[PDB]
Design a protein around this ligand. Structure first.
Ligand SMILES: CCCO[C@H]1CN[C@@H]([C@@H](O)[C@H](Cc2cc(F)cc(F)c2)NC(=O)[C@H](CCc2ccccc2)N2CC[C@@](CC(C)C)(NC(C)=O)C2=O)C1
Length: 386
């Protein structure tokens, strides 16, 4: 899928987006790739943060559905008017699809300054779509109206250093492969975990390790409420009971240096002199995931290079600065973009599973690497879900 490769741009903190066209004649828009929602929505009115928007009155194929729509995210909400129109992906499958578009009229803390995207593509399932599950999500529409296979795969590729808008516009941010798996985007083997339920992309975490050390909690706590694979979230988000045990474990391993409480709350950056980031004092994190085979599991391992998110310095100096990108959740585990940055991720909707392999694009050093390994005959499993 050579024509599909390098079709993404962006970064964890501002989001990863793809180019799409909407309307007739085609209107070009950058669209945030969000596997943690199911609405396809674009800015349709002027906004300070938007350099362009969808103009329905200029599209001959636009269809007004005479329905309002409201989507509340965990942080952020927009309001809009439902319609349909022809939709294309210039660096995707060679197809045109008629899709539901929410034309965005009111916005609160949804759009992001400098992000360079004007809409959001909800890749999840109908069950969590607004107004209700009767509104067909884009991917469902695409698969029904075309011969594209019922799968997509994501390579989110973080720089390991801060990128300015000039660089984020010029840089390749990754690949979204629609309908296939591209072998050039990963090393090693793909391991599959089942989709528990087709609403969010929901998974089960069986075990959690920090530098090989079991956090030793009942497996249900790891999936308290739910656990999801979500490109529309920056951080690894952990249920409070898990989060607190993890931060204590990470703090204990990284003890040789001391960090402000606000770093651990994800709010303050820490800087080191250029090139001296002490990655070695920070632990790797392993998430064990339910296998397809009964009583089998595998693990995904990420480095501090995934969970310390590069940020530009307060005075923009030569220092290498980062934010701690693991945070508290009251709505379950969100395996966000910083974890996704470690792996090539296959959303195999047809076979109801999510695949993981080590990203050919992942940031590492000469001493440690991201890993996808198995199998482990861990016991319990089976009531790990909520
Ligand atoms: C079906 C609806 C329910 O789905 C829920 C499960 N899936 C979630 C996503 O669909 C949603 C998409 C989305 C993307 C976007 F750019 C703007 C949006 F408003 C929504 N993301 C989120 O809501 C979290 C909230 C985190 C949070 C949690 C708690 C407190 C503050 C922030 N956000 C938003 C900003 C972002 C996004 C990044 C792309 C720039 N970055 C950072 C640094 O916070 C991130 O992580 C929602």
């Amino acid at each position: 899928f050579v024509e599909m490769v390098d079709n993404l741009r962006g970064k964890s903190g501002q989001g990863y987006y793809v180019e799409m066209t909407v309307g007739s004649p085609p209107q070009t828009l950058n669209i945030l790739v969000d596997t943690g929602s199911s609405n396809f929505a674009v800015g349709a009115a002027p906004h300070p943060f938007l350099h362009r928007y969808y103009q329905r009155q200029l599209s001959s194929t636009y269809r007004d559905l005479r329905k309002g729509v409201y989507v509340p995210y965990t942080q952020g909400k927009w309001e809009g008017e439902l319609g349909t129109d022809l939709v294309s992906i210039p660096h995707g499958p060679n197809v045109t699809v008629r899709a539901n578009i929410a034309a965005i009229t009111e916005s609160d803390k949804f759009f992001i300054n400098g992000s360079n995207w004007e809409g959001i593509l909800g890749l999840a399932y109908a069950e969590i779509a607004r107004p209700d599950d009767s509104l067909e999500p884009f991917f469902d529409s695409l698969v029904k109206q075309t011969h594209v296979p019922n799968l997509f795969s994501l390579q989110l590729c973080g720089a390991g250093f801060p990128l300015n808008q000039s660089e984020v516009l010029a840089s390749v941010g990754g690949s979204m492969i629609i309908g296939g798996i591209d072998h050039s985007l990963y090393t090693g083997s793909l391991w599959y975990t089942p989709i528990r339920r087709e609403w969010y992309y929901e998974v089960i975490i069986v075990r959690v390790e920090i530098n090989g050390q079991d956090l030793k909690m009942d497996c249900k706590e790891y999936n308290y409420d739910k656990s999801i694979v979500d490109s529309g979230t920056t951080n690894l988000r952990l249920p409070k009971k898990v989060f607190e045990a993890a931060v204590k474990s990470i703090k204990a391993a990284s003890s040789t240096e001391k960090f402000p409480d606000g770093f651990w709350l994800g709010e303050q950056l820490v800087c080191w002199q250029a090139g001296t980031t002490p990655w070695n004092i920070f632990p790797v994190i392993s998430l064990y995931l339910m296998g397809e085979v009964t009583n089998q599991s595998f693990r995904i391992t990420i480095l501090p290079q995934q969970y310390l998110r590069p940020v530009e310095d307060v005075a923009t100096s030569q220092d290498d600065c980062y934010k701690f990108a693991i945070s508290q959740s009251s709505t379950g585990t969100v395996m966000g973009a910083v974890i996704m940055e470690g792996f090539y991720v296959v959303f195999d909707r047809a076979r109801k599973r999510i695949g993981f392999a080590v990203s050919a694009c992942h940031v590492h050093d000469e001493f440690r690497t991201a890993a996808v390994e198995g199998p482990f005959v861990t016991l319990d499993m089976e009531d790990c879900g909520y």
